[PDB]
Amino acid sequence: PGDTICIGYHANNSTDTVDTVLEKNVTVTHSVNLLEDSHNGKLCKLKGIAPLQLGKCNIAGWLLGNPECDLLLTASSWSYIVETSNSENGTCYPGDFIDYEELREQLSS
Amino acid sequence: GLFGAIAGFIEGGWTGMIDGWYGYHHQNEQGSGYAADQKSTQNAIDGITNKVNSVIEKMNTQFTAVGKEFNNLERRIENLNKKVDDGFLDIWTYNAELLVLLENERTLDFHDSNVRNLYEKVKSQLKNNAKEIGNGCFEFYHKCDDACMESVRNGTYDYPKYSEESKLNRE
Amino acid sequence: GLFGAIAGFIEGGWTGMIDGWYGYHHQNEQGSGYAADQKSTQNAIDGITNKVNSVIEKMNTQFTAVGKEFNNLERRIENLNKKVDDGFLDIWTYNAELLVLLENERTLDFHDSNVRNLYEKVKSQLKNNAKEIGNGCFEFYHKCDDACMESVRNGTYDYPKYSEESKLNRE
Amino acid sequence: GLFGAIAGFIEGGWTGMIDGWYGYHHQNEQGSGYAADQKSTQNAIDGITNKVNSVIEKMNTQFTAVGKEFNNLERRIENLNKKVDDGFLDIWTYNAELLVLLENERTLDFHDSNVRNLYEKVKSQLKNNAKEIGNGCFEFYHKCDDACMESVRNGTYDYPKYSEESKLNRE
Amino acid sequence: HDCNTKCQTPHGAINSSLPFQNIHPVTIGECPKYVRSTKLRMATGLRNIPS
Ligand SMILES: *[C@@H]1O[C@H](CO)[C@@H](O)[C@H](O)[C@H]1NC(C)=O
Ligand SMILES: *[C@@H]1O[C@H](CO)[C@@H](O)[C@H](O)[C@H]1NC(C)=O
Ligand SMILES: *[C@@H]1O[C@H](CO)[C@@H](O)[C@H](O)[C@H]1NC(C)=O
Ligand SMILES: *[C@@H]1O[C@H](CO)[C@@H](O)[C@H](O)[C@H]1NC(C)=O
């Protein structure tokens, strides 16, 4: 019935699991996630500058000034350029826009 | 575990020790209780925090990396771009998953090591003034009050002081 | 090895134990023989199998992926392609060789750990009812028949039952 | 350390031992001194040399790799080239830094292991002919001259020769 | 919307100091490295054995 001292380790109600080399699904008392899987569903500013919204126009339609793109005439500064699924107005007169992809890469600058 | 202690000769953990990863449970005439070992716990916390921070810190952020666009006469370069992006993705995914696996194993083993070393430390402090049960516990052959227990905990236990009494009670 | 047992204080292995990675050899009045320790062996097999499977599993397949062709005014992009392929080759070759090196070390060390822990496990069951030879063997101070031996092997050895007898032969 | 010896139960190193990584200090009537353990030291040197050589050896050199140039209508492919070069730089810098961190830890732990295993080697040679102090030291219960010490150093200590004297002095 | 971010993807912006992400390979700004993993969790504490 003598005095006693024991050596031991922590347990808690944590349900966090990690995988290891030798064993899957090990429950651990504490852990940190290194993988981000959450986003906010919005288009935000970059460097505190808003993106440019072309809306129903695309970059060709914007730059050439497709008459459907008149709403873009006031646009002046941006962090990145946003095309959407309804951007269908570009070259209303049929033909080829030469070095269009290069111009697009350049214009993002 | 590598060091044989956690889930080893010390079968389970203590929900009653809320202030540390490793520590002590005592029972005497005066009472019963848990106490964290501050030194080993703080060293382990600092070490592991340094490990996680060191893994994250080495990842300079991905600055702008954007998709390239291609015309109908550019299939080869589009495919080159896709090959590069996919290849880098294979590399970073493989390394991150495998690295997390390996590092998790090392971390668990690190804890097992810290528990084994605390147990063997107490064992070597007490020597034959107590008997090892085997489940991480020691039963004293002498009366050991709160001050004595604390002496064990801060590594100042006085073996000669209780040696004679212990030798008397052991026989 | 890190844990000092394999190629350590136990100089060699047993070609006579064909049914497990780790286990026991005994000699007593009823006869002599080997028996694998099933639990540690199976745990090690499962662990190592999980390791190999995890190495192979992380190589998400390469879906159809091909070489590119170039005309005589496209040397720069051809060279970009070659730089990419060679670069990936450098990374994957270095990583594969080094990873295999380090993991091989870890596997051998894992075995060494498992042997040391099994030995210390038996040791802690028997305490002073046997004397340690030093070569992984324990010699009993009491008679230990086949049932007793099996009790030792499965961790149900009854120390108090044989303590007085052991004490008698030891003195 | 992981194995509890270096910066552990053996608190500090010896600036007086100039001829090895690991070894022994003895003091007796004939005199006093440090002596390196040659076998374990050379094994450790060989191991670490193989580790370093293996790290350097796996980087088959980079043969000519030169920057590509692009005109003002080739910005997208120029950016592909930059993406490739930056991606490779991110990968090799992260891998080199993290690898050096992890391997340094392993190396320090390896040394700690070698000291612990040397200590247990001496302990198991001497058995109860000496008492463990706890600071890496053993006190003989018998007189142990230069030849005896040397038997310890070269792993040939004779327990029965000094057993009787030890049993007499211990009691 | 008028929010600010360091990292934008086509699904939405990401706000995180984490090294890896599984939302999208396409990113603009200052973002985590894209990987295919569905989880990357480092142990910090020990095996949890409440039993
Ligand atoms: C788990 O236990 C901790 C400690 O009391 C507590 O803070 C927490 O609320 C518990 N889990 C729940 C109910 O969220
Ligand atoms: C350890 O415990 C004793 C018991 O009270 C105390 O007197 C002493 O100051 C402590 N030693 C340390 C490490 O300060
Ligand atoms: C182990 O062996 C002993 C002796 O035969 C037996 O009494 C006991 O039931 C066994 N325990 C297990 C784990 O089966
Ligand atoms: C060990 O020491 C003894 C006594 O000095 C010596 O005779 C012998 O050669 C040594 N043995 C070995 C294996 O080096």
Numbering used by the authors:
A (entry chain E): 9 to 54, 54A, 55 to 83, 83A, 84 to 95, 95A, 96 to 114
B (entry chain F), C (entry chain D), D (entry chain B): 1 to 171
E (entry chain E): 275 to 325
Give excerpts from the publication:
The hemagglutinin (HA) protein of influenza viruses binds to sialic acid receptors on host cells and is the major target of neutralizing antibodies. In a previous study, we described five naturally occurring human mAbs that potently inhibit the 1918 H1N1 pandemic influenza virus. One notable difference between these two antibodies, however, is that mAb 1F1 not only inhibits the 1918 H1N1 virus, but also 1943 as well as select 1947 and 1977 human H1N1 viruses. A greater understanding of the basis for such broadly cross-reactive antibodies may suggest novel vaccine or therapeutic approaches to influenza virus infection. This study provides a detailed characterization of one such antibody, 1F1, and highlights common, emerging properties of cross-reactive anti-head antibodies.
To better understand the mechanism of 1F1 neutralization and its ability to cross-react with H1N1 viruses separated by decades of virus evolution, we determined the crystal structure of Fab 1F1 in complex with SC1918 HA using diffraction data that extend to 3.3 Å, but we report a nominal resolution of 3.55 Å due to anisotropy. The crystal structure of the 1F1-SC1918 complex contains two complete HA trimers in the asymmetric unit. Each HA protomer (6 in all for the two trimers) is bound by a single copy of the 1F1 Fab in the expected stoichiometry of 3 Fabs per HA trimer. Of the 6 Fabs in the asymmetric unit, only two are fully ordered. In the remaining four copies, only the variable domains are well defined, as observed in other Fab and Ig-domain containing structures. Fab 1F1 binds an epitope at the apex of the HA spike, in the HA1 “head” region (overview). The 1F1 epitope contains several residues that typically contact the sialoglycan receptor, including 135, 153, 183, 190, 194, 222, and 225 (RBS with glycan, contact residues labeled). Many of these contacts are mediated by CDR-H3, which inserts its tip into the RBS. 1F1 also contacts a number of more variable residues outside the RBS, including 133A, 145, 156, 159, 186, 187, 189, 192, 193, 196, 227, and 228. In total, 1F1 binding to the HA buries a total of 1440 Å2 of protein surface at the interface.
